[PDB]
């Protein structure tokens, strides 16, 4: 540990001040379990993807918007952002701003080219986190995140951010090794599965989400670009009613040694 001249107090205070700099609902850090002061002080919180070399970004000349004069939820036919969806065409969100039960794994939101305001109903992911979260130390896993408010099914939590890297860099970082990884493959679309999100040095609070074989949140691919399927938002949505102080977990598979989730249907392997 290169931070050995800092005290448990100052390191925790420094990480706390790092949390306070995050824009949006507050994020808190508690540790009533062991003596570790905080996660890595070198970690940087970000609000958007951290592209690296070799990662081709979407071309703005291929981008299209909708002509919705924001969009109307009771008339999804007029909006052109939902053309990739089969009939019955509908937005991914209901009147309460939550993802619908019948919505698939791909969410088509509006973008900066639409004639839309920032409070369009199809910009839930873009507006960002609304739930105050708390980072805490768990029993047998590392750090974890729990919600401080009730999160009914369909509530948007946050996105999995970090560096976007190529397959060669992902293998080069596939490994130090201690059973801890922050790599998240962008593999929602098999026709273009090339990049990986690395939350080691840059990332979101979702970087502390743990795995569970009976998860309460799940990933949705929030796509605001045209046909670009190599980079998209990894949006976490609650698939179960999450009560306050309940740990937020998702299936790393997507549906170190053994899994400590403690579910009655634990497969025993994280596979990630």
């Amino acid at each position: 540990d290169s931070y050995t001249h800092l005290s448990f107090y100052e390191k925790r205070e420094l990480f706390r001040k790092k949390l306070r700099e995050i824009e949006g609902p507050e994020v808190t850090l508690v540790n009533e379990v062991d003596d570790e002061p905080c996660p890595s002080l070198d970690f940087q919180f970000i609000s958007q993807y951290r592209l690296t070399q070799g990662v081709i970004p979407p071309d703005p000349n291929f981008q299209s918007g909708c002509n919705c004069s924001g969009c109307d939820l009771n008339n999804p036919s007029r909006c052109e952002c939902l053309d990739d969806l089969d009939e019955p065409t509908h937005f991914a969100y209901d009147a309460q701003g939550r993802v619908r039960a019948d919505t698939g794994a791909v969410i088509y939101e509006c973008n900066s080219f639409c004639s839309c305001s920032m409070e369009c109903p199809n910009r839930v992911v873009q507006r960002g986190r609304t739930l105050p979260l708390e980072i805490f130390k768990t029993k047998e896993k590392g750090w974890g995140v729990r919600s401080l408010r009730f999160a009914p099914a369909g509530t948007f939590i946050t996105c999995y951010l970090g560096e976007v890297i190529t397959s060669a860099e992902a293998a080069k970082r596939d490994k130090d090794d201690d059973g801890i990884t922050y790599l998240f493959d962008l593999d929602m679309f098999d026709d273009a599965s090339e990049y990986t999100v690395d939350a080691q040095n840059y990332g979101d609070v979702s970087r502390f989400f743990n795995h569970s074989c009976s998860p309460n949140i799940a990933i949705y691919s929030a796509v605001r670009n045209h046909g670009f399927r190599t980079i998209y938002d990894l949006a976490f949505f609650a698939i179960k009613d999450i009560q306050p102080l309940e740990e937020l977990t998702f299936d790393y598979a997507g549906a170190r040694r053994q899994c400590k989730c403690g579910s009655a249907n634990c497969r025993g392997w994280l596979f990630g």
């Binding site: 794994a105 790599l183 998240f184 493959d185 593999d187 929602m188 990986t196 949705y220 997507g254 990630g272």
Partner: peptide, 15 residues
């Protein structure tokens, strides 16, 4: 395939 987190693909079962 990998020791990496996956989205599970877009095969529908209602995420």
């Amino acid at each position: 395939q990998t020791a990496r987190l996956s989205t599970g693909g877009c095969a529908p079962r209602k995420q």
